[PDB]
């Protein structure tokens, strides 16, 4: 199936599956208005994410039930790592949308804001490549809800493939075997923080509980 694609084909498949950077709806004010815009943006981003997940190698080979569960578990993670990726070359700011640069000084928002900023600074420090990013984002989709009759060795097989995919990229980058293990570890340890930001982000969302699709994703927690 999708467990035969080479490292190059794996990358190309993920790169071609990449969703577009959606725009938001430029004066000043407001906290309600602020989270109204982020809700509207995330809601439209969800639709692209759902159809992005379909193009992820191995995801279509799973049942409708599992596909729902995996997306319900990691939708905020995928959104946030995408946000962090956008804001790489924008130090001190978050690129929610090409027409939306927010700094830290603009409930619970600024706490997650700083964590998101720190994550982006980490990507900049490590000089994260787009080929590595699409791998990490795909790992999130498959790994986040894998431990929450039916075997999931297929998911592990795809995950092991993406691991090989990541390593193959770094070996082509001229990194030594020691440097290959290390940076691999560094990338996957960030997913722990991405999970954390999602959890903190999730609970703040169902504490102010407006989008219909978001309500279903949010009630899943």
């Amino acid at each position: 199936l999708a467990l035969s694609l080479t490292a190059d084909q794996m990358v190309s498949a993920l790169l071609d599956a990449e969703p577009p950077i959606l725009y938001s709806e430029t004066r000043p004010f407001s906290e309600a208005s602020m989270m109204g815009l982020l809700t509207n943006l995330a809601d439209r981003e969800l639709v692209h994410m759902i159809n992005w997940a379909k193009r992820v190698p191995g995801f279509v080979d799973l049942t409708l039930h599992d596909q729902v569960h995996l997306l319900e578990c990691a939708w905020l993670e995928i959104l946030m790592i995408g946000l962090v990726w956008r804001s790489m070359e924008h130090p001190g700011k978050l690129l929610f949308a090409p027409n939306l640069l927010l700094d830290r000084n603009q409930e619970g928002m600024v706490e997650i804001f700083d964590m998101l900023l720190a994550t982006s600074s980490r990507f900049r420090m490590m000089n994260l490549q787009g080929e590595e990013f699409v791998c990490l984002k795909s790992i999130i989709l498959l790994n986040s809800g894998v431990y929450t009759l039916e075997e999931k060795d297929h998911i592990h097989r795809v995950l092991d493939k993406i691991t090989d995919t990541l390593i193959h990229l770094m070996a082509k980058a001229g990194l030594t075997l020691q440097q290959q293990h290390q940076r691999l570890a560094q990338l996957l340890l960030i997913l722990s923080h991405i999970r954390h930001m999602s959890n903190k982000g999730m609970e703040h969302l169902y504490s102010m509980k407006l989008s219909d699709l978001l309500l279903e994703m949010l009630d899943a927690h």
């Binding site: 639709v47 759902i50 159809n51 379909k54 409708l64 596909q67 729902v68 997306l71 319900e72 219909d212 699709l213 279903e216 994703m217």
Partner: peptide, 9 residues
């Protein structure tokens, strides 16, 4: 669920 429907459509 909308999510299940969008995974179908």
């Amino acid at each position: 669920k909308i999510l299940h429907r969008l995974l179908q459509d």
